[PDB]
Design an enzyme around this catalytic site. Structure first.
Site, PDB file in Angstrom:
ATOM      1  N   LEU A  35      -5.487  11.250   0.796  1.00  0.00           N
ATOM      2  CA  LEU A  35      -5.348  10.090   0.518  1.00  0.00           C
ATOM      3  C   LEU A  35      -4.880   8.482  -0.035  1.00  0.00           C
ATOM      4  O   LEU A  35      -4.216   9.104  -1.032  1.00  0.00           O
ATOM      5  CB  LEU A  35      -7.186   9.098   0.048  1.00  0.00           C
ATOM      6  CG  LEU A  35      -7.582   8.061   0.265  1.00  0.00           C
ATOM      7  CD1 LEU A  35      -7.657   8.028   1.803  1.00  0.00           C
ATOM      8  CD2 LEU A  35      -9.132   8.356  -0.783  1.00  0.00           C
ATOM      9  N   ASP A  36      -4.256   7.669   0.629  1.00  0.00           N
ATOM     10  CA  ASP A  36      -2.821   6.506   0.282  1.00  0.00           C
ATOM     11  C   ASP A  36      -3.525   6.576  -1.023  1.00  0.00           C
ATOM     12  O   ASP A  36      -4.367   5.739  -1.098  1.00  0.00           O
ATOM     13  CB  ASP A  36      -2.761   6.172   0.905  1.00  0.00           C
ATOM     14  CG  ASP A  36      -2.757   6.082   2.487  1.00  0.00           C
ATOM     15  OD1 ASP A  36      -2.930   7.622   2.454  1.00  0.00           O
ATOM     16  OD2 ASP A  36      -2.344   5.710   3.340  1.00  0.00           O
ATOM     17  N   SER A  37      -2.384   5.697  -1.706  1.00  0.00           N
ATOM     18  CA  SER A  37      -2.633   4.752  -2.950  1.00  0.00           C
ATOM     19  C   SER A  37      -2.982   3.407  -2.516  1.00  0.00           C
ATOM     20  O   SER A  37      -4.541   3.345  -3.257  1.00  0.00           O
ATOM     21  CB  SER A  37      -1.311   4.186  -3.318  1.00  0.00           C
ATOM     22  OG  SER A  37      -1.039   3.752  -1.859  1.00  0.00           O
ATOM     23  N   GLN A  40      -7.183   5.013  -1.795  1.00  0.00           N
ATOM     24  CA  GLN A  40      -7.942   4.731  -3.803  1.00  0.00           C
ATOM     25  C   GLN A  40      -8.384   3.399  -4.055  1.00  0.00           C
ATOM     26  O   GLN A  40      -9.704   3.358  -4.633  1.00  0.00           O
ATOM     27  CB  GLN A  40      -7.026   5.312  -4.481  1.00  0.00           C
ATOM     28  CG  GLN A  40      -7.631   6.152  -5.617  1.00  0.00           C
ATOM     29  CD  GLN A  40      -7.183   4.628  -7.471  1.00  0.00           C
ATOM     30  OE1 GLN A  40      -6.828   3.758  -6.595  1.00  0.00           O
ATOM     31  NE2 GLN A  40      -7.592   4.842  -8.227  1.00  0.00           N
TER      32      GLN A  40
END
Ligand SMILES: CCCCCCCCCCCCCCCCCC(=O)OC[C@H](COP(=O)([O-])OCC[N+](C)(C)C)OC(=O)CCCCCCCCCCCCCCCCC
Ligand SMILES: NC(=O)C1=CN([C@@H]2O[C@H](COP(=O)(O)OP(=O)(O)OC[C@H]3O[C@@H](n4cnc5c(N)ncnc54)[C@H](OP(=O)(O)O)[C@@H]3O)[C@@H](O)[C@H]2O)C=CC1
Ligand SMILES: CCCCCCCCCCC[C@H](O)CC(=O)SCCNC(=O)CCNC(=O)[C@H](O)C(C)(C)COP(=O)(O)O
Ligand code: SF4
Ligand code: SF4
Lengths: 75, 114, 340, 386, 174, 6, 198, 156
Positions: A35-37, A40
């Site tokens: 999951l991308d920064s 999140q």
């Protein structure tokens, strides 16, 4: 104390761009989910709405573990 | 090299600020779609926010990132307080304009200069 | 005879489609002129409505793109000069209420014939004729049958003339969606067979328009009888309630014999000023949407249909109240789809 | 949002276009954040792409109530950069039409102020006088407003044969017309109330926020750029600056009525002492050659062709020249490369500073007070938006 | 030299005077007298169609292209009227007419673009383009406002008599 | 009134 | 020939040294040009200090800010040339203090020194993109609410990239990439012959 | 008695009422507003012709757009045009609003108001002369006189 984990697990799978049955408490949003920064970020926010408590800007950075999130929410 | 810093001393600190703005926008998208009676979906809008926040994902320099959020924060303040109206918000969605194909054959068939 | 297409694609650019469009003032029309004007096509809009009403069309056309000509259906000469310099003729002439001086035949079959007839004499490359969907030469509603009569005739006046056949259209300013929503004034909302067994498939106006426009600029469509339909079918029940749902107004579907109801349509039909319901309209409303087995329209002609729920919010918003005016479609519940 | 309420762009009360996003606790204004740019049009960028003489018409449009006085500021600025100065008759003309223009601005400011307040008869009384003045413009320039008469090297064409006499008949009478307005507003038992003690600005604060206009003069600071730094021949005339005390909407008003009076004193003189002479510099280099000359002399055609097609070719430099436009200090900072077209031309607008003060003036004030204060700043959105 | 616009005993006479001013609204009555006075003055308005507001010879008004008496259009396409137009309004393209002379194939003044500065009147060497007196050319459609050579030449022919009189009156000044 | 001559 | 009064050229020159000595630290160049105007050029860091000395010094009171502007010399590394023009109602003179700022190297704000600058600094950000630290509320003033790009920059197209029209389909005003019907004719005007500098 | 005649006469009445009393809502963007205030003023009384000095966005029959319609003001113009009655009209005034005027090539100016509001009469001139506006308002009056709404109803 587990009730927190019960809620935290419910929030992670509901957004549906993560945890397609790969949801695990040790699982880390950045480390294995990929999951991308930013995503999140969305997650922590999500948790904040269900918990009713808004976590700070930074501590979001330290918890990428649902289990660790439950650790902090209990505090 | 040797450049004076604007708001953060390093990309790291700068990224902190981007996180905050993202949150801000994320929390705001729903409100706008309601206070402006925009005909869009909160989810849809929230993706747009993501789009923009990444359109500029490539920037590596700390100074450029700081001014980008300087601009970003004023953008949401006008978005909020309903200074921007429905017409200035929807423009982000490029709803009326006809999308242009990027396929070479497509361009060849239509424009002299691609 | 042609105009090389130069430009980037927006206003103030050229596409090379000079097109007479006789019934542009219409709900569908408005949209047809929009895209044609956006693309940069030369649009000749024949009009018999007063100049004040035709003003809305002026702004979407670029300078010199739109030319308005005075035209009378009974007068053959007016149609003659309109198509003099057009190479594409699009016919959207239609009405729901047989008017004192124009019968369903006239608006659908008689007039739309003379028009294409002249268009040929002129040498227009292609003619697009629009007739309602599920139009049997035997269909109950005089309207639908008469329309069917036309699509045949015009073939003989103009061979290989495209015949798009749209379903009832979904769009702001449409009837299909507004009519039901406006049943609010009526305390009870009659629905033949309690709104069942008349599955209906709406189609967004733009989709129809874009489709029509794409026809004008594509060689694949000749003699084609496309059918722009939609992205999902519906039993009239959900449609009615859904509408009332977005309008946030109560729903009381009430069974009333179509027999007696055809009479209610007759009543409004009696009214002099644009009867709101039409005996034929009533019948058409209940005429169940036919399944699709004909030349594909949307998608086939290049536009992917747009679901009703997506834009319904914009069409039905005006009908809400002081507070209901602030509700959005996704917190609202979208009605189920019955393909039947 | 404390009932935030856009004053709204369409409002008879708002000159032109002003969104004043105001948060008002009932009828009291807590904060005024004026929005601007509803009339930004690009005047500063457009000028960079135009030659000096074809950018002169932009200045008339910057603040068009004061059509000419604005031109004089660009004129002066372009003359300084060229180190050329206009001929003696042209100078007096510019002061003649400079003042006529001040009256025109004050008749607008005082009468439009009243229309928002609710007094409507003063506007019709003085717009007839305005009309008569416009006619001077037209018979001198050709246009009622937006003349283009004052060019960078003097005026364009000598006064028609007979104008001076009429700028006399009018001046001889206009006074009574100002007197009338007075009997209607200066002492009205009601004008005073809505104007007195509204928007008081201290002297130190007025200098600090860069007010520079009647707004300063009204607070008692004595500064008229026309007496302190004389431009043209405003030095050879004699007038009295109308300084004010207890600065407030009423006091400044009285000041604007008094400069209408003092300008008639300056106009009289200009008519009494305007010299025989030429109205444009004789340097074909800067001023276009007379049409008889360009049609009979080769050097004049060449100079006519080059001047109209290419331009002055001002020597490289930069200058900030400020005059006393009716609103306040109007200045042009004109940076210039050696080219015939300018490089930058920031127009200082008496008005960008005044609006900013709206916040520090209208505090704890009612909705009606805000309407009165926008009037006492003579805001023409053209100069502010540029 | 400066002046104090508003820079400033209590006696019964004085007070009674002041109290009467507040109590019986004396100054308010003064204001009413002024308006009653004008009610009796002659109104300054003009019947607009029948009587016209005076415009002197330099009025710029509407563009026209003049012709030599003989009948040869004055413009010789030097194209500096295009060069000095501030708004980019005039578009000129030219080619040698068969006569061999120099004439404009297309002369288009976009009046909506034009800001009626009157510099074109100024710039022309042959003075072919002039600011004509007419100001009443309001048009139903935007296209009519765009003017090609034929409309301007036609405008020139219609108003040539007055244009000639106006230029006659003001040329010494220029 | 451009010209005072009829 | 303009009526130059050497009396001025000298007095202003003398003040220019005065300031240069008083603030050796930030003044880089001081010059009383012809046209008799003094311009003290300061390092960007000297924005606050040089202004304050001029606003509050008995021998140089420069109370009001006439203007704050930013020429843009694209060639110059530091693109913008913030210019502050100040007036002195006590010594009836004017001085201009000009600094240099690049696109992403912000200048300090002087709203503290003169509150007049609250608006002009917002104007400079909107048009040129220079940023002013410590500004109370920096936000676009002249441009549209959603405008992208800083307009007075020499690298911005005059016509711009977006224009607005009303679209019926969407019943709302809508931007579209600019399509102009007669492009700005770019007359080349510079003459290939110079003028022998006097 | 032929209704057709009866209809025309009726229409005319209707046209006379709208054409005699046009209550203009003016915007005064820019300067051409000063040249309209002159019309309202005594030399060229607008009222004499039935044009009221000014009215709100609602009670207004005609909108006179005077002055540059800049991109920020463009959404508003529309709003106010859209907030007026069913019989409404727009008189563009000024080269700055007929087309783009001196500011046509600018990035902040809409090139014409007829790109944002349908325009019925275009009054030309940088400060279109007040008499010219008056001529333009009078031509709107001839435009209305010719409108034949009920006869088209009857023949429709
Ligand atoms: C109470 C509401 C008003 C009631 C009617 C008042 C009078 C109206 C009137 O006299 O109309 C004059 C108008 C006069 O207009 P007109 O078109 O006859 O022209 C008269 C001259 N000008 C152009 C200057 C106005 O009547 C008409 O428009 C003609 C048809 C009249 C039909 C009346 C019966 C229907
Ligand atoms: N949802 C729908 O509306 C559907 C429509 N269709 C068909 O598509 C066409 C367009 O539909 P739509 O735009 O809604 O129809 P409208 O009711 O809007 O009428 C279309 C146009 O036809 C003109 N017109 C009507 N009668 C006459 C006449 N006797 N002489 C000359 N012109 C006339 C009208 O102009 P004016 O009013 O100015 O006279 C109008 O602008 C119709 O013909 C219809 O049969 C098919 C399926 C669904
Ligand atoms: C519907 C509502 C509309 C609201 C839209 C909104 O106002 C417009 C908008 O979002 S404007 C986006 C610009 N936002 C940035 O430019 C931040 C850039 N931030 C970085 O570049 C970081 O320094 C980093 C290098 C870590 C990025 O790395 P990462 O891949 O994101 O992890
Ligand atoms: S200047 Fe006079 S002559 Fe030369 S082109 Fe323009 S109009 Fe024709
Ligand atoms: S048109 Fe000429 S006058 Fe009317 S606004 Fe634009 S510039 Fe000012």
């Amino acid at each position: 104390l587990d009730g927190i984990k019960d809620r935290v697990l419910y929030v992670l799978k509901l957004y549906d761009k993560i945890d397609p049955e790969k949801l695990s408490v040790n699982s880390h949003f950045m480390k294995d989910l990929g999951l991308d920064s930013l995503d999140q970020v969305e997650i922590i926010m999500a948790m904040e709405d269900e918990f009713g408590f808004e976590i700070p800007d930074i501590d979001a950075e330290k918890l990428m573990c649902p289990q660790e999130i439950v650790d902090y929410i209990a505090d | 090299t040797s450049v004076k810093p604007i708001f953060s001393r390093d990309l790291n600190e700068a990224k902190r600020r981007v996180r905050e703005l993202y949150r801000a926008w994320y929390r705001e998208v729903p409100n706008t779609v309601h206070l402006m009676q925009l005909d869009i979906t909160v989810k849809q809008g929230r993706d747009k926010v993501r789009e923009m926040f990444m359109k500029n994902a490539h920037v590596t320099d700390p100074r450029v990132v700081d001014l980008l959020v300087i601009k970003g924060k004023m953008e949401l303040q006008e978005t909020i307080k309903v200074w921007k109206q429905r017409t200035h918000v929807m423009r982000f969605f490029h709803e009326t304009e006809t999308p242009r194909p990027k396929d070479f054959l497509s361009k060849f068939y239509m424009g002299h200069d691609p | 005879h042609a105009v090389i297409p130069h430009g980037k694609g927006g206003r103030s650019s050229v596409s090379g489609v000079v097109a007479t469009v006789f019934g542009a003032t219409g709900f569908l029309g408005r949209y047809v002129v929009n895209h044609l004007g956006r693309m940069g096509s030369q649009v000749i809009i024949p009009y018999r409505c007063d100049v004040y009403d035709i003003m809305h069309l002026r702004l979407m056309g670029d300078l010199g793109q739109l030319t308005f000509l005075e035209w009378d259906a009974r007068d053959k000469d007016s149609i003659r000069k309109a198509v003099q310099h057009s190479n594409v003729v699009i016919n959207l002439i239609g009405r729901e209420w047989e008017t004192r001086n124009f019968d369903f035949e006239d608006v659908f079959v008689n007039i739309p014939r003379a028009i294409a007839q002249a268009s040929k004499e002129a040498g227009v490359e292609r003619f697009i004729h629009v007739s309602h969907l599920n139009a049997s030469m035997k269909s109950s509603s005089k309207s639908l049958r008469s329309k069917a009569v036309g699509e045949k005739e015009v073939r003989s006046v103009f061979p290989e003339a495209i015949i798009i056949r749209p379903s009832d259209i979904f769009g702001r300013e449409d009837r299909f969606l507004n009519h039901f929503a406006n049943y609010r004034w009526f305390l009870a909302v009659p629905l033949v067979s309690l709104g069942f067994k008349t599955v209906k498939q709406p189609v967004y106006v733009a989709d129809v328009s874009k489709g029509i426009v794409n026809a004008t600029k594509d060689p694949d469509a000749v003699g084609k009888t496309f059918a722009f339909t939609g992205p999902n079918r519906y039993l009239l029940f959900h449609l009615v309630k859904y509408i009332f749902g977005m309008t946030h107004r109560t729903f009381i579907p009430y069974p009333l014999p179509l027999f007696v109801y055809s009479w209610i349509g007759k009543l409004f039909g009696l009214s002099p000023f644009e009867p709101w319901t039409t005996k034929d309209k009533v019948e058409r409303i209940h005429i169940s949407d036919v399944m699709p087995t004909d030349l594909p329209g949307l998608e086939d002609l290049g536009v992917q249909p747009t679901p009703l729920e997506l834009k319904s919010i914009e069409v039905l918003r005006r009908h809400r109240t002081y507070r209901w005016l602030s509700s959005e479609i996704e917190e609202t519940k979208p009605a189920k789809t019955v393909n039947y | 949002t404390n009932m935030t309420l856009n004053f709204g762009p369409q409002h008879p009360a708002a000159h032109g276009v002003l969104r004043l996003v105001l948060e008002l606790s009932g009828e009291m204004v807590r904060k005024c954040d004026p929005h601007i740019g509803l009339l930004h049009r690009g005047t500063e960028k457009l000028i960079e792409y135009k030659t000096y003489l074809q950018a002169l018409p932009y200045f008339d449009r910057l603040d068009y109530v004061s059509m000419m006085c604005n031109e004089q500021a660009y004129s002066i600025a372009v003359e300084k950069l060229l180190n050329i100065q206009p001929p003696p008759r042209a100078q007096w003309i510019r002061v003649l039409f400079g003042e006529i223009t001040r009256i025109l601005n004050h008749i607008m400011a005082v009468t439009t102020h009243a229309l928002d307040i609710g007094a409507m008869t003063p506007f019709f009384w003085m717009f007839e006088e305005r009309e008569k003045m416009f006619e001077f413009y037209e018979r001198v320039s050709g246009a009622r407003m937006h003349a283009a008469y004052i060019r960078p090297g003097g005026v364009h064409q000598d006064l028609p044969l007979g104008l001076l006499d009429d700028i006399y008949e009018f001046s001889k009478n206009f006074s009574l017309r100002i007197d009338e307005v007075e009997e209607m507003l200066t002492n009205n038992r009601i004008w005073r109330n809505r104007t007195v003690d509204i928007g008081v600005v201290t002297a130190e604060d007025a200098l600090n926020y860069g007010f520079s206009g009647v707004m300063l003069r009204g607070s008692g600071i004595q500064w008229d750029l026309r007496k302190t730094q004389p431009y043209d021949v405003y030095d050879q005339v004699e007038f009295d600056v109308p300084i004010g005390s207890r600065g407030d909407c009423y006091d400044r008003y009285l000041c604007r009525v008094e400069e209408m009076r003092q300008s008639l004193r300056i106009i009289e003189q200009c008519l009494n002492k305007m010299p025989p002479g030429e109205i444009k510099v004789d340097d074909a280099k800067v001023s276009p050659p007379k049409r008889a000359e360009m049609k009979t002399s080769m050097e004049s055609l060449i100079h006519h062709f080059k001047l109209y097609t290419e331009g002055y070719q001002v020597p490289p430099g930069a200058t900030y020249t400020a005059i006393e436009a009716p609103k306040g200090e109007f200045g042009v900072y004109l940076v210039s490369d050696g080219s015939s077209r300018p490089y930058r031309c920031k127009i200082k607008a008496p008005g960008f500073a005044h609006l900013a003060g709206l916040d520090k003036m209208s505090k704890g004030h009612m909705l009606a007070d805000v309407v009165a204060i926008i009037g006492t700043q003579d805001i023409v959105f053209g100069e502010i938006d540029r | 030299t400066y002046k104090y616009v508003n820079k400033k005993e209590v006696d019964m006479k004085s007070a009674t005077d002041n109290a009467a001013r507040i109590l019986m609204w004396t100054e308010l009555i003064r204001g009413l007298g002024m308006t009653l006075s004008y009610l009796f003055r002659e109104p300054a308005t003009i019947n607009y169609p029948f009587e016209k507001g005076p415009l002197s010879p330099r009025f710029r008004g509407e563009h026209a292209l003049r012709r030599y008496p003989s009948g040869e259009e004055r413009c010789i396409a030097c194209k500096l009227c295009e060069a000095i137009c501030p708004a980019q309004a005039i578009t000129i393209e030219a080619e040698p007419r068969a006569d061999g002379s120099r004439r404009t194939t297309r002369y288009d003044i976009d009046m909506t673009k034009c800001i009626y500065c009157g510099f074109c009147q100024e710039a022309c060497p042959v003075d072919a383009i002039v600011e004509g007196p007419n100001f009443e050319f309001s048009t139903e459609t935007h296209e009519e406002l765009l003017y090609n050579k034929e409309k301007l030449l036609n405008n020139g022919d219609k108003w040539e008599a007055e244009i000639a009189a106006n230029i006659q009156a003001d040329y010494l000044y220029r | 009134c451009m010209t005072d001559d009829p | 020939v303009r009526p130059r009064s050497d009396v001025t050229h000298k007095q202003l020159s003398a003040f220019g040294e005065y300031v240069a000595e008083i603030l050796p630290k930030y003044v880089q160049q001081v010059q009383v040009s012809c046209l008799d105007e003094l311009e003290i050029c300061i390092h960007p860091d000297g924005v606050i200090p040089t202004l304050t000395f001029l606003r509050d010094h008995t021998n140089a009171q420069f109370k009001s800010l006439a203007d704050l502007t930013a020429v843009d010399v694209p060639t110059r590394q530091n693109r913008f040339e913030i210019v502050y023009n100040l007036l002195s109602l006590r010594f009836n003179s004017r001085i201009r203090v000009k600094t240099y700022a690049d696109e992403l190297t912000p200048i300090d704000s002087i709203v503290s020194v003169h509150i007049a600058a609250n608006w002009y600094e917002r104007e400079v950000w909107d048009m040129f993109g220079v940023f002013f630290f410590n500004h109370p509320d920096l936000r676009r003033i002249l441009t549209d609410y959603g405008f992208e790009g800083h307009p007075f920059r020499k690298d911005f197209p005059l016509t711009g990239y977006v224009e607005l029209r009303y679209d019926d389909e969407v019943k709302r005003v809508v931007a579209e990439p600019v399509e102009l019907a007669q492009e700005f004719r770019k007359f080349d005007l510079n003459s290939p012959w110079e003028a022998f500098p006097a | 008695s032929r209704a057709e005649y009866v209809v025309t006469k009726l229409d005319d009445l209707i046209n006379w009422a709208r054409r005699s009393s046009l209550w203009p809502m003016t915007f005064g963007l820019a300067c051409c507003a000063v040249e309209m205030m002159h019309m309202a003023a005594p030399r060229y009384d607008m009222d004499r012709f039935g044009v009221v000095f000014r009215a709100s966005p609602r009670q207004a029959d005609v909108m006179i757009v005077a002055g540059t319609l800049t991109n920020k003001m463009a959404p508003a113009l529309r709003k106010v045009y859209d907030q007026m009655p069913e019989p409404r009209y727009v008189v563009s005034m000024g080269s700055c609003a007929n087309g783009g005027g001196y500011y046509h090539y600018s990035y902040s100016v809409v090139r014409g108001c007829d790109r944002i509001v349908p325009v019925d009469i275009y009054v030309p001139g940088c400060p279109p002369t007040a008499e010219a506006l008056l001529y333009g308002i009078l031509q709107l009056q001839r435009k209305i006189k010719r409108e034949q709404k009920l006869k088209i109803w009857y023949r429709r």
